[PDB]
Scaffold this active site. Structure first.
Site, short mmCIF file in Angstrom:
data_model
loop_
_atom_site.label_atom_id
_atom_site.label_comp_id
_atom_site.label_asym_id
_atom_site.label_seq_id
_atom_site.Cartn_x
_atom_site.Cartn_y
_atom_site.Cartn_z
N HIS E 60 0.70 -1.36 -0.01
CA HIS E 60 -0.44 -0.30 -0.23
C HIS E 60 0.67 1.76 -0.10
N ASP E 90 7.31 21.45 -27.67
CA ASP E 90 7.44 19.85 -27.20
C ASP E 90 7.88 19.96 -25.63
N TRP E 125 7.16 0.51 4.31
CA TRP E 125 7.74 1.37 3.16
C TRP E 125 8.72 1.27 3.75
N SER E 152 13.38 6.19 -13.83
CA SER E 152 12.65 7.21 -14.45
C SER E 152 13.21 8.53 -14.03
N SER E 153 12.88 8.24 -12.25
CA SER E 153 12.09 9.16 -11.74
C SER E 153 13.90 11.06 -12.09
N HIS E 228 12.51 12.21 3.35
CA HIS E 228 11.85 13.55 3.21
C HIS E 228 11.87 14.80 2.76
N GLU E 230 11.24 13.32 -0.05
CA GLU E 230 10.44 12.71 -1.22
C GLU E 230 8.88 13.19 -0.84
N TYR E 232 8.45 16.03 0.00
CA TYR E 232 8.58 17.49 -0.52
C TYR E 232 8.21 17.71 -1.93
N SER E 243 -2.00 27.32 -7.54
CA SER E 243 -1.59 28.10 -7.43
C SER E 243 -2.16 29.02 -9.38
N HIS E 277 14.33 14.39 11.93
CA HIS E 277 12.77 14.39 12.87
C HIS E 277 12.01 13.10 12.53
N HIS E 278 12.14 12.05 11.71
CA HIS E 278 12.40 10.62 11.33
C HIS E 278 12.66 10.00 12.75
N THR E 303 6.58 27.22 4.19
CA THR E 303 4.81 26.74 3.82
C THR E 303 3.86 28.16 4.11
N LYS E 306 3.13 30.53 1.77
CA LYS E 306 1.91 30.25 1.10
C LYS E 306 0.45 29.79 0.95
N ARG E 428 0.96 1.69 14.74
CA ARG E 428 1.08 1.22 13.70
C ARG E 428 1.38 -0.46 13.12
C1 HEA Z 1 3.37 15.01 1.39
C2 HEA Z 1 3.24 14.96 2.65
C3 HEA Z 1 3.56 15.52 4.37
C4 HEA Z 1 3.56 16.78 4.09
C5 HEA Z 1 3.78 17.88 3.95
C6 HEA Z 1 4.68 17.01 4.89
C7 HEA Z 1 5.06 18.20 6.97
C8 HEA Z 1 5.35 18.45 7.64
N1 HEA Z 1 6.16 16.71 8.02
FE1 HEA Z 1 5.74 15.03 7.64
N2 HEA Z 1 5.24 13.20 6.77
C9 HEA Z 1 5.00 12.24 6.10
C10 HEA Z 1 4.24 13.14 4.97
C11 HEA Z 1 4.43 14.73 4.75
N3 HEA Z 1 4.74 15.52 5.97
C12 HEA Z 1 4.83 10.74 6.16
C13 HEA Z 1 4.08 9.82 5.38
C14 HEA Z 1 5.15 10.69 6.88
C15 HEA Z 1 5.21 9.32 7.50
C16 HEA Z 1 6.31 8.47 7.14
C17 HEA Z 1 6.50 7.24 8.05
O1 HEA Z 1 6.72 7.58 9.19
O2 HEA Z 1 7.14 6.12 8.05
C18 HEA Z 1 6.15 12.02 7.84
C19 HEA Z 1 6.56 12.26 9.47
C20 HEA Z 1 6.30 13.01 9.82
C21 HEA Z 1 6.85 13.13 11.46
C22 HEA Z 1 7.47 12.24 11.73
C23 HEA Z 1 6.70 11.81 13.12
C24 HEA Z 1 6.76 10.04 13.70
O3 HEA Z 1 7.58 10.30 13.14
O4 HEA Z 1 6.53 10.29 14.82
C25 HEA Z 1 7.07 14.50 11.81
C26 HEA Z 1 7.73 14.71 12.65
O5 HEA Z 1 8.78 15.70 12.59
C27 HEA Z 1 6.85 15.17 10.70
C28 HEA Z 1 6.71 15.96 10.40
C29 HEA Z 1 6.05 17.10 9.21
C30 HEA Z 1 6.61 18.97 9.48
C31 HEA Z 1 7.07 19.62 11.23
C32 HEA Z 1 5.90 19.09 8.82
C33 HEA Z 1 5.33 20.62 7.38
O6 HEA Z 1 5.99 20.32 6.32
C34 HEA Z 1 4.11 21.10 7.91
C35 HEA Z 1 4.13 23.14 7.59
C36 HEA Z 1 2.67 23.36 7.87
C37 HEA Z 1 2.61 23.72 8.04
C38 HEA Z 1 2.83 24.31 9.60
C39 HEA Z 1 0.88 24.39 8.32
C40 HEA Z 1 0.59 25.26 7.03
C41 HEA Z 1 1.87 26.51 7.88
C42 HEA Z 1 1.33 27.86 8.11
C43 HEA Z 1 -0.34 27.06 8.36
C44 HEA Z 1 1.71 28.60 8.84
C45 HEA Z 1 1.16 29.17 10.20
C46 HEA Z 1 1.88 28.10 11.12
C47 HEA Z 1 2.66 27.35 12.36
C48 HEA Z 1 3.36 29.30 12.28
C49 HEA Z 1 3.63 26.44 12.96
N4 HEA Z 1 5.79 14.56 9.65
C1 HEA Z 2 -0.29 8.83 -1.53
C2 HEA Z 2 -0.12 8.11 -0.51
C3 HEA Z 2 -1.32 6.99 -0.22
C4 HEA Z 2 -2.99 7.39 -0.92
C5 HEA Z 2 -3.41 7.50 -1.44
C6 HEA Z 2 -3.10 6.50 0.92
C7 HEA Z 2 -4.76 6.60 1.37
C8 HEA Z 2 -5.57 5.46 2.08
N1 HEA Z 2 -5.37 4.78 3.06
FE1 HEA Z 2 -2.83 5.03 2.91
N2 HEA Z 2 -0.74 4.83 3.47
C9 HEA Z 2 0.22 5.07 2.75
C10 HEA Z 2 -0.01 5.87 1.71
C11 HEA Z 2 -1.07 6.12 0.83
N3 HEA Z 2 -2.50 5.96 1.75
C12 HEA Z 2 1.74 5.11 3.73
C13 HEA Z 2 2.67 5.72 2.78
C14 HEA Z 2 1.19 3.82 4.89
C15 HEA Z 2 2.38 3.89 5.23
C16 HEA Z 2 3.17 2.44 4.63
C17 HEA Z 2 3.39 2.12 6.56
O1 HEA Z 2 2.70 2.28 7.45
O2 HEA Z 2 4.51 1.30 5.49
C18 HEA Z 2 -0.87 4.08 4.48
C19 HEA Z 2 -1.35 3.14 6.02
C20 HEA Z 2 -2.42 3.65 5.59
C21 HEA Z 2 -3.04 2.45 7.02
C22 HEA Z 2 -1.84 2.19 7.88
C23 HEA Z 2 -1.65 0.33 7.55
C24 HEA Z 2 -0.67 0.29 8.86
O3 HEA Z 2 0.35 0.17 8.84
O4 HEA Z 2 -1.36 -0.37 10.30
C25 HEA Z 2 -4.40 2.71 6.54
C26 HEA Z 2 -5.52 2.55 7.61
O5 HEA Z 2 -5.42 2.53 8.60
C27 HEA Z 2 -4.21 3.80 5.15
C28 HEA Z 2 -5.83 3.34 4.83
C29 HEA Z 2 -6.32 4.73 3.78
C30 HEA Z 2 -6.95 4.75 3.47
C31 HEA Z 2 -8.69 4.37 3.70
C32 HEA Z 2 -6.76 5.57 1.45
C33 HEA Z 2 -8.00 6.36 1.15
O6 HEA Z 2 -8.83 5.00 -0.09
C34 HEA Z 2 -9.13 6.47 1.81
C35 HEA Z 2 -9.63 7.35 0.38
C36 HEA Z 2 -9.16 8.00 -0.86
C37 HEA Z 2 -9.51 6.96 -1.82
C38 HEA Z 2 -9.63 6.21 -1.61
C39 HEA Z 2 -9.02 8.54 -3.34
C40 HEA Z 2 -7.32 7.94 -3.42
C41 HEA Z 2 -7.34 7.45 -5.17
C42 HEA Z 2 -6.54 7.87 -5.61
C43 HEA Z 2 -5.27 8.04 -5.13
C44 HEA Z 2 -6.24 7.73 -7.13
C45 HEA Z 2 -5.57 9.12 -7.63
C46 HEA Z 2 -5.20 8.89 -9.37
C47 HEA Z 2 -6.18 10.75 -10.08
C48 HEA Z 2 -6.11 11.67 -9.32
C49 HEA Z 2 -5.50 9.89 -11.23
N4 HEA Z 2 -3.11 3.32 4.70
O1 PER Z 3 8.28 13.44 6.44
O2 PER Z 3 7.49 15.23 6.97
CU CU Z 4 10.26 14.30 7.17
#
Ligand code: HEA
Ligand code: HEA
Ligand code: PER
Ligand code: CU
Ligand code: CDL
Ligand code: CDL
Ligand code: CDL
Ligand code: PEE
Ligand code: PEE
Ligand code: PEE
Ligand code: PEE
Ligand code: CUA
Ligand code: K
Ligand code: MG
Lengths: 100, 65, 90, 100, 459, 186, 230, 47, 131
Positions: E60, E90, E125, E152-153, E228, E230, E232, E243, E277-278, E303, E306, E428
């Site tokens: 998943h 193109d 994953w 590919s990426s 991380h 990734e 972003y 935008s 932070h992970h 962030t 924006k 989890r």
């Molecule tokens: C695209 C996906 C995405 C994005 C944008 C982010 C954004 C951020 N993530 Fe991420 N993060 C994940 C995807 C993402 N993350 C995933 C997938 C994991 C788990 C991976 C795994 O463990 O397997 C993860 C895990 C993860 C952890 C791990 C927690 C743990 O392992 O127990 C933490 C903690 O530091 C973290 C922090 C953040 C922070 C601080 C931001 C910042 O970018 C957020 C910034 C945005 C805001 C802050 C809000 C908008 C800003 C404002 C409204 C301004 C005013 C706000 C303030 C002044 C605070 N992320």
């Molecule tokens: C972007 C990536 C992505 C997306 C879309 C989702 C979508 C969803 N995920 Fe996600 N999920 C992950 C990334 C994602 N997840 C990752 C990275 C983990 C951690 C893996 C790990 O633990 O090792 C995770 C873990 C995770 C768990 C934890 C299982 C566990 O480890 O114990 C669960 C269930 O609770 C869950 C549920 C769901 C559900 C219910 C939806 C969605 O079904 C919710 C409903 C939304 C939709 C059905 C729309 C989705 C449609 C598309 C994605 C297609 C878009 C295409 C076009 C627009 C062209 N996810």
């Molecule tokens: O990963 O934030």
């Molecule tokens: Cu991170």
């Protein structure tokens, strides 16, 4: 007797009087692996000088146990008995300064 | 040529054969099966059943069914 | 300039801001030096900052302290309210 | 013909970076009061004493370190059965006579 | 022809098509997870087949990240509009563009084939060793897929960077969004490849990096040094889309264009230096923890800028224009949803809070709100905006208020309860749990089945 | 910002100026094919990026973040007892690494740690001074702060003398209560 | 008037190359993998022919595009080596006190640094002739001699080393870093075997690419020598 | 100690160590700021 | 010298040097659960500790990365092979605190709970003396 007697003599003494507290040389880090290896090396050097039966070396083993998990000690203690423990090779049979 | 002006002209001009759409949906359906079929196969392999009965790994009342 | 609207910097300091490219470089350098200095002058300095007998007591601290001292509140606040675990059952 | 980098950029940033690293390290040592005198030897005191005895002639030359400890591992017991320091010294003496 | 085509716009369509196909497998796995978690007991997976659940969660995550959202937001919309936005005929590298999509498909086939043929086990994953290196051959197959995907990426990133050499107009914010993601890929991927090769060496070449005297924490550093960046690389293209949609639909010029651009650049630099932070709970040094916590909180500044610049884009727009278009609703919903995900990110950024919330479903809900809700909706909104240009039909989405409302409500029913169980606490990557966590798990499960049903109404 | 190419642009001397930027901006540019066009494009970029007030805020943020980053890296290498670049101590067993052990205690007591530890009473309601006393002496004895941490700590009174229950929750009163029961030493 | 770009509409090498890659995975014999590698070489060479035939478009931006791609690739090569240096230094705290024999700092480093320097001088002469629209036949054969000696020396070193990959992470990192350098040396052979004089001279991207790559590999060996031997 | 049914436990529950209390209060301290950030931004999402 | 190996005077005079005791804690199976036991959290051997005492927990992992988590004690430390992480705690109230492994560790990641019971110091001493 002196208040700073523990620091005097050696840094080792501090944990010898307080076995379950941080060692001054490793308190900065949460990971205590290096602490375990120093304590084991000290047990190994004690036996070479005093023998296994000496109460001092027996306590140096208790001190090693305080920081070393049993599964690591049992393995390292077998290597020591065979004669393959790298922390106990006599210094004149070390290869650390050879070929580089 | 006018027919070649638009990419995927038949589809955009709404003349394409429906089989192309069917294949796309079938391909997605097959992709989905890759999560369900191995689940059933693995369950049977290690248990002898394709799917469990809810809470059959725990103690159940006499009248539970 | 720290926490400064640069529109203000452009207006009040026109000659210092004439070269905007150079102005940008100073902005980066100044804040780079600030970050570097914080680590090695506020965090790093060893065996410092442990003078707890010199806790700063601001003018507001004393205003509020004297007010409570004048009344009995300061004495009452500092008094230990309970120093036993179990109440006595009649 | 237009220049993008410093005219001597490669040497400047290479030697320059090395200089800053070296100078910063000296400053860091001064602030922490680190001893700056290089010791190439091990610090095991009992061992260094045995080595002095060998240099003084109190312990015969080429005597192994396991021939001097109060606890021997299995591999060193194997070696002790075939150890003959006296024969080794005579062999070295014979070599010197042949060479001269 | 079909497979031989080099047209950049055709290839863009292929990327979206393949993302939906692979997405079906992704959603199915998600349904399996939520069904299992509906109560305590075994529901659809036997206790003797618990290894399958571990594989389900692993696949998943990997598929949704690398085979669905990344190919959709960085391969699909980019390959279709970027050469048009750049007023160029193109894409710079036609033949490379063709092979990139073919590579993605071939790596997908390898992964799914490994499900069918290999023993089904999972290691997350994040493929942490030593667990990843003591597994069966399915782990080897997954590694091949990731490495192939990496090829590919990187080549696609090279393709987009070359637009700077040929762009005949102005670099719009969206173009800046893709370029910076490309830079992030060029700098992060080579490190990932190295650590993946070391995983292979221990799996297949009798290497000893991840056995005693070798530090397993080493993998986590190199992995998350890509990990991380990734997240972003997956969000920045979404920001670029948001935008364009807000400016176009509201008929308002982007406000603070240069601040938007400089905010994207800033997020990238900062995102390249905050990876640990992970790794808060491993036992890193106090000063390291403080550095990473400090820099992680800084990312909110760019962030945040924006977000507020987007808000003023929607403010003041003419009332006569109909605001119920699905693309506009999704773009607005992104701001509302992303703030939730980001704020929770800042909460978990505090390491002491993180001790309680690491490896709990609070983290799940955090990154779902950003990806499963925010990124998905952004991709949908972008495709919807380009419906006339792309030309697809046979769907009822463009004006469907029911779909938007039902999706928003039900998606929140799934992940809002996952924040609660994070303080319950429910770990989890588990399938069985204590009976006192059923209520919230049940509510989220009801949300998952409902969302799937709403996906059928579009046709 | 001038709008006529005849009016020159002021430049300082140095390595980051308007003249320095002009020399390098068009090095890789296919669009600056003649003086008139080159200057027009150069001023267009300068006007857009360097005369934009909000852009300077990001310049501050990158400098601050990078300065912290460079310094934390340098500090680890220069002072952290566990980071080795020289090899003398790594060619010896752990008990013999005296020169590296010298970094330990100075590194264990940074200034900010001494300055901020007393403020734990703004996060703990019961026995915030539970870990203050330590007879060994590797670290200083800790004294609780007299004021709340500045900022978002509105839930606690500005000064702890204002709080009625503060003194009764101290590790000293708790020790008194439990010692009266014979329950525990601490 | 003509179009700015001569668009390429179709391509079939991509399918073949992607299938060739799959064969590496879906195979039951290592001989199949050997012959599959030859297929890869052949089809990658066809892609190179397509690049040479694109010269007929007389597009000024083509040189620049390819040159910058090489820059990106070189960057990826540098960052892969960085990852190995990182793996090496992360476990630095467990080096130099283990019962293994590390490498000497006299023999291998000197002859290798002297050898690789001569390789750079040859490539530099090739560049100089390239600038002067001249050619010297013997140059390429000097490269072949240098590569032969490098291969001869590296083979003997590995075979006569008394410590194995499973002995310590130090040994693993030493062998792996040296192998990674060798692979990049072998890739240099792959590129240099086709060096010839082409009369279109400085609009040929091959010449600049070779110069950059050879310098990268030699510079990378300086870093390795300091880390491991010295 | 143990999870209980249908409990929000926002920020944590039932601490039994001084550090556990610290964690709960750190979350509680920041929670109002998070609400402010959300409310202040969402209120302006409109035409 | 003997003095290069510091030892307290009591042991040099013949006092017994302390030994260590190791025990294994395993999940109680579904078929072995009793009427009142908590499913997925009970274990067959609990870890008893004294309350109102400073305790140092040294946590490592033998084979793969586990994670020792006790939410009530505010502890979540990764049991990583090669790292012996120190965690200090001071329990303030008696009770039984349940936790679970917090790092995917293989097939049965969900089936190795962490049960810690904190008792009065007098009770802990009696327990330790008997067990
Ligand atoms: C695209 C996906 C995405 C994005 C944008 C982010 C954004 C951020 N993530 Fe991420 N993060 C994940 C995807 C993402 N993350 C995933 C997938 C994991 C788990 C991976 C795994 O463990 O397997 C993860 C895990 C993860 C952890 C791990 C927690 C743990 O392992 O127990 C933490 C903690 O530091 C973290 C922090 C953040 C922070 C601080 C931001 C910042 O970018 C957020 C910034 C945005 C805001 C802050 C809000 C908008 C800003 C404002 C409204 C301004 C005013 C706000 C303030 C002044 C605070 N992320
Ligand atoms: C972007 C990536 C992505 C997306 C879309 C989702 C979508 C969803 N995920 Fe996600 N999920 C992950 C990334 C994602 N997840 C990752 C990275 C983990 C951690 C893996 C790990 O633990 O090792 C995770 C873990 C995770 C768990 C934890 C299982 C566990 O480890 O114990 C669960 C269930 O609770 C869950 C549920 C769901 C559900 C219910 C939806 C969605 O079904 C919710 C409903 C939304 C939709 C059905 C729309 C989705 C449609 C598309 C994605 C297609 C878009 C295409 C076009 C627009 C062209 N996810
Ligand atoms: O990963 O934030
Ligand atoms: Cu991170
Ligand atoms: C997330 C989901 C929800 C999303 C919602 C939101 C969506 C928003 C909108 C998104 C829009 C994106 C952009 C769209 C752009 C569209 C452009 C377009 O149309 O391009 C034109 C393009 C082609 O049109 P064309 O130009 O006319 O092409 C002419 C051909 O080139 C030439 O014509 P031809 O006839 O000569 O063609 C050749 C043809 C010849 O075909 C035939 O002869 C077919 C004969 C009939 C076969 C039928 C299948 C039989 C299956 C049997 C199975 C038996 C099982 C038995 C089991 C027994 C068990 C006991 O095919 C072949 O020879 C090869 C076919 C290969 C592909 C099919 C593969 C199927 C799966 C295979 C699996 C194999 C697994 C093996 C495992 C092995 C393990 C060991 O269109 C398509 O391809 C169709 C696209 C249709 C959808 C478009 C999007 C619509 C909007 C979205 C709807 C929702 C979709 C949801 C996903 C699907 C869910 C399931
Ligand atoms: C003793 C031995 C000694 C040693 C011997 C050593 C020998 C060494 C040999 C070395 C070389 C071997 C390889 C040779 C390759 C030659 C390539 C070449 O030059 O071809 C020219 C040749 C040109 O053909 P042509 O003779 O001019 O005429 C072709 C026809 O007129 C047709 O005209 P067309 O090209 O316009 O039509 C193509 C198109 C026509 O379109 C359609 O069929 C309808 C429209 C599309 C329907 C919707 C499809 C789903 C949406 C996909 C979206 C993304 C598409 C991306 C682009 C396509 C990528 C394939 O449909 C297809 O054929 C494929 C459509 C896409 C299929 C995949 C879609 C996803 C399904 C997922 C299902 C599971 C989940 O290329 C082709 O047309 C065919 C190429 C076939 C390559 C197949 C490679 C498959 C690899 C699969 C994975 C392998 C591992 C696992 C396999 C497990 C199996 C159990
Ligand atoms: C690729 C080959 C690499 C070989 C590496 C070997 C390393 C060891 C030392 C070799 C020393 C010779 C020079 C090597 C450097 C390259 C020379 C060069 O560039 O030549 C260009 C020269 C002409 O090149 P071009 O492209 O036509 O003109 C380029 C310039 O524009 C115009 O060029 P230029 O006129 O300015 O000349 C540049 C000058 C620069 O070089 C020097 O001045 C270096 C002086 C070093 C002195 C060291 C003392 O080089 C020469 O003068 C080379 C003269 C070579 C004459 C060879 C005549 C045939 C000999 C056949 C021998 C057969 C023996 C059979 C035994 C059978 C026993 C049973 O190339 C040749 O003539 C081809 C041969 C190159 C030299 C091969 C040396 C092989 C040595 C084998 C020794 C075997 C001993 C066996 C003992 C057995 C005892 C029982
Ligand atoms: C070209 C002529 C020949 C030059 C030959 C040079 C050969 C040797 C080169 C070795 C690598 C370069 C570093 C040399 C360092 C020499 C001095 C030295 O030994 O330093 C040791 C010292 C610590 O030694 P220990 O005592 O073992 O540890 C005590 C506890 N921490 O380490 C260092 O200072 C060197 C390692 C760090 C080098 C880089 C400086 C540190 C900061 C890096 C910042 C990176 C981020 C970006 C910075 C951008 C610019 C501000
Ligand atoms: C205007 C701004 C300044 C206002 C005044 C500030 C001031 O004087 O604060 C003093 C006050 C101390 O006063 P008392 O506790 O009452 O007395 C000391 C008793 N021992 O200081 C504080 O509260 C602490 C101030 C800390 C500033 C920290 C700056 C940043 C430091 C580095 C942070 C981490 C960077 C990244 C990691 C680096 C790792 C090496
Ligand atoms: C983007 C390109 C620049 C990235 C720079 C990242 C540097 C971040 C600095 C983080 C830091 O302080 O490093 C500590 C941290 C380790 O901390 P602990 O495991 O606690 O060990 C400390 C003492 N034992 O350092 C690392 O992991 C550094 C990893 C190397 C990064 C190399 C990047 C190379 C880019 C090309
Ligand atoms: C590797 C792929 C690199 C792709 C980017 C660089 C491509 C490049 O510059 O190749 C062309 C360049 C020179 O061609 P020109 O006609 O001057 O330029 C093309 C039209 N202007 O060609 C070469 O570099 C020659 C390549 C010869 C050796 C090929 C070996 C292939 C080995 C594959 C192993 C698997
Ligand atoms: Cu052990 Cu999870
Ligand atoms: K279940
Ligand atoms: Mg974890």
């Amino acid at each position: 007797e002196s208040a700073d007697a523990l620091f005097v003599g050696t840094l080792d003494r501090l944990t010898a009087e307080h076995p379950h507290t941080d060692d001054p040389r490793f308190a900065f880090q949460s990971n205590q692996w290096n602490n375990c290896e120093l304590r084991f090396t000290q047990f190994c050097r004690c036996t070479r000088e005093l023998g296994e039966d000496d109460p001092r070396c027996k306590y140096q083993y208790y001190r090693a146990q305080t920081v070393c998990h049993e599964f690591l000690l049992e393995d390292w203690m077998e290597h020591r008995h065979r004669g393959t423990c790298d922390l106990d090779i006599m210094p004149d049979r070390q290869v650390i300064h050879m070929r580089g | 040529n006018l027919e070649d002006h638009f990419d995927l002209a038949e589809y955009m001009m709404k003349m394409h054969n429906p089989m192309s759409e069917y294949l796309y949906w079938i391909a997605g359906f097959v992709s989905g099966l890759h999560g369900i079929l191995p689940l059933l196969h693995s369950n049977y392999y290690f248990s002898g059943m394709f799917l469990p009965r809810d809470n059959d790994n725990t103690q159940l009342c006499d009248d539970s069914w | 300039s720290i926490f400064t609207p640069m529109d203000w910097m452009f207006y009040y300091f026109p000659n210092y801001s004439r070269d905007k490219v150079a102005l940008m470089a100073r902005q980066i350098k100044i804040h780079f030096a600030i970050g570097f200095a914080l680590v090695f002058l506020v965090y790093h300095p060893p065996y410092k900052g442990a003078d707890y007998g010199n806790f700063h007591k601001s003018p507001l601290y004393w205003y509020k302290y004297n007010q409570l001292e004048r009344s009995g509140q300061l004495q009452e606040n500092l008094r230990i309210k309970r120093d036993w675990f179990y109440d006595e059952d009649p | 013909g237009r220049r993008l980098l410093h005219g001597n950029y490669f040497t400047r940033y290479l030697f320059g970076s090395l200089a800053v690293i070296w100078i910063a390290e000296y400053a860091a040592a001064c602030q922490y009061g680190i001893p700056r005198h290089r010791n190439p030897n091990w610090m095991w005191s009992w061992w260094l004493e045995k080595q002095n005895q060998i240099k003084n002639g109190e312990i015969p030359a080429n005597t192994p370190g396991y021939a001097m400890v109060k606890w021997n591992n299995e591999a060193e017991q194997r070696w002790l059965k075939t150890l003959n320091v006296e024969a080794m010294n005579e062999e070295f003496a014979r070599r010197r006579e042949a060479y001269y | 022809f079909y497979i031989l085509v080099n047209n950049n716009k055709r290839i863009g369509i292929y990327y979206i098509k393949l993302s939906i196909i692979i997405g079906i497998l992704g959603i199915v796995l998600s349904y399996i997870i939520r069904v299992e978690l509906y109560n305590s007991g075994n529901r659809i997976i036997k206790y003797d087949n618990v290894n399958y659940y571990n594989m389900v969660i692993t696949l998943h995550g990997l598929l949704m990240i690398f085979y669905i959202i990344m190919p959709g937001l960085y391969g699909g919309i980019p390959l279709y509009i970027l050469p048009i936005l750049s007023v160029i005929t193109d894409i710079v590298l036609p033949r490379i563009n063709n092979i990139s999509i073919i590579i993605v498909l071939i790596s997908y086939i390898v992964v799914i084939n490994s499900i069918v043929i290999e023993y089904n086990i999972g290691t997350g994953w994040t493929l942490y060793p030593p667990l990843s290196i003591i597994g069966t051959v399915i782990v080897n197959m997954i590694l091949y897929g990731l490495i192939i995907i990496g090829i590919s990426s990187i080549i696609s990133a090279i393709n987009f960077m070359n637009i700077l050499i040929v762009i005949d107009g102005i670099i719009y914010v969206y173009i800046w969004s893709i370029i910076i993601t490309s830079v992030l890929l060029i700098i992060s991927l080579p490190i990932l490849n190295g650590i993946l090769l070391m995983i292979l060496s221990d799996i297949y070449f009798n290497s000893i990096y991840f056995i005693l005297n070798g530090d397993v924490v080493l993998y986590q550093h190199l992995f998350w040094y890509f990990g991380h960046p990734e997240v972003y690389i997956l969000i920045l293209p979404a920001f670029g889309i948001i935008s364009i949609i807000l400016s176009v639909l509201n008929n308002k010029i982007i406000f603070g264009m240069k601040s938007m651009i400089l905010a994207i650049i800033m997020i990238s630099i900062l995102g390249s230096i905050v990876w640990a932070h992970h790794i808060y709970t491993v036992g890193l040094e106090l000063d390291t923890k403080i550095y990473f916590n400090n820099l992680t909180l800084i990312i909110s500044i760019p962030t945040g800028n924006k977000i507020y610049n987007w808000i003023i884009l929607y403010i003041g727009s003419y009332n006569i224009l109909y605001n119920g278009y699905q693309s506009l609703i999704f773009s607005i919903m992104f701001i509302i949803i992303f703030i939730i995900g980001g704020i929770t990110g800042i909460i978990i950024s505090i390491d002491i809070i993180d001790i309680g919330l690491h490896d709990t479903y609070y983290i799940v809900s955090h990154f779902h709100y950003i990806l499963s809700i925010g990124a998905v909706i952004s991709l949908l909104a972008g495709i919807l905006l380009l419906k006339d240009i792309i030309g697809y039909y046979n769907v009822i989405i463009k004006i469907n208020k029911y779909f938007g409302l039902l999706l928003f409500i039900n998606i929140n029913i799934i992940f809002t309860p996952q924040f609660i169980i994070g303080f319950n606490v429910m770990p989890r990557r588990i399938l069985e749990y204590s009976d006192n966590i059923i209520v919230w798990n049940l509510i989220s499960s009801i949300g998952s089945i409902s969302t799937i049903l709403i996906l059928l109404s579009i046709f | 910002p001038p709008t006529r190419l005849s009016t020159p642009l002021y430049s300082e001397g140095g390595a980051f100026t308007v003249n320095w930027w002009r020399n390098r901006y068009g090095l890789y540019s296919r669009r600056q094919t003649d003086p008139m066009l080159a200057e027009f494009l150069f001023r267009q970029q300068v006007k857009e990026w360097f005369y934009d007030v909000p852009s300077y805020n990001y310049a501050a943020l990158v400098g601050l973040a990078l300065g912290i980053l460079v310094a934390v890296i340098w500090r680890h290498f220069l002072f952290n007892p566990d980071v080795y670049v020289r090899r003398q101590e790594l060619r010896k067993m752990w008990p013999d690494r005296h020169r590296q052990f010298a970094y330990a205690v100075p590194y264990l007591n940074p200034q900010l740690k001494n300055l901020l530890l007393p403020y734990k009473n703004s996060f703990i309601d019961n026995e915030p001074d539970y870990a203050d006393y330590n007879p060994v002496g590797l670290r200083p004895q800790r004294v609780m702060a007299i004021r709340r941490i500045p900022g978002f700590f509105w839930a606690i009174p500005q000064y702890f003398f204002e709080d009625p229950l503060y003194t009764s929750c101290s590790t000293k009163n708790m020790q008194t209560i439990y010692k009266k029961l014979g329950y525990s030493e601490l | 008037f003509e179009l700015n770009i001569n668009i390429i509409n179709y391509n079939y090498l991509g399918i073949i190359i992607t299938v060739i890659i799959s064969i590496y995975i879906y195979n039951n014999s290592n001989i199949i993998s050997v012959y599959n590698s030859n297929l890869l070489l052949i089809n990658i060479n066809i892609w190179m022919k397509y690049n040479i035939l694109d010269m007929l478009n007389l597009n000024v931006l083509d040189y620049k595009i390819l040159l910058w791609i090489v820059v990106i690739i070189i960057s990826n090569e540098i960052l892969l080596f960085v990852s190995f240096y990182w793996i090496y230094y992360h476990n630095y705290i467990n080096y130099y006190h283990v019962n293994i024999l590390i490498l000497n700092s006299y023999n291998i480093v000197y002859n290798n640094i002297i050898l690789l320097t001569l390789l750079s001088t040859i490539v530099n002469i090739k560049f100089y002739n390239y600038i002067l629209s001249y050619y010297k036949y013997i140059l390429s054969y000097l490269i072949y001699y240098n590569n032969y000696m490098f291969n001869n020396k590296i083979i003997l070193e590995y075979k006569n080393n008394s410590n194995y990959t499973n002995d310590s992470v130090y040994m693993t990192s030493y062998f792996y870093i040296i192998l990674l350098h060798y692979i990049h040396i072998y890739d240099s052979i792959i590129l240099i075997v086709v060096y010839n004089y082409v009369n279109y001279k400085n609009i040929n991207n091959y010449y600049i690419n070779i110069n950059i790559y050879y310098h990268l590999i030699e510079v990378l060996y300086i870093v390795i020598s300091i880390l491991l031997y010295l | 100690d143990i999870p209980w049914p249908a409990r929000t436990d926002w920020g944590g529950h039932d601490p039994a160590t001084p550090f556990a209390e610290l964690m709960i209060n750190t979350h509680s301290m920041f929670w109002p700021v998070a609400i402010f950030i959300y409310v202040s931004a969402i209120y302006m999402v409109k035409k | 010298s003997p003095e290069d190996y510091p030892t307290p005077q009591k042991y040099l005079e013949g006092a017994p040097i302390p030994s260590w005791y190791s025990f294994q804690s395993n999940l109680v199976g579904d078929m072995d659960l009793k009427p009142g036991m908590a499913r997925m959290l009970e274990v067959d051997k609990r870890l008893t500790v004294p309350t109102r005492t400073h305790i140092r927990f040294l946590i490592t992992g033998a084979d793969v990365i586990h994670s020792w988590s006790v939410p009530s004690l505010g502890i979540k430390c990764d049991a990583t092979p090669g790292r012996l992480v120190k965690i200090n705690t001071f329990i303030q109230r008696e009770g039984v605190f349940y936790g679970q492994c917090s790092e995917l560790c293989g097939t049965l990641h969900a089936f190795m709970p962490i049960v810690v019971e904190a008792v009065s110091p007098e009770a802990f001493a009696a327990h330790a003396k008997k067990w």
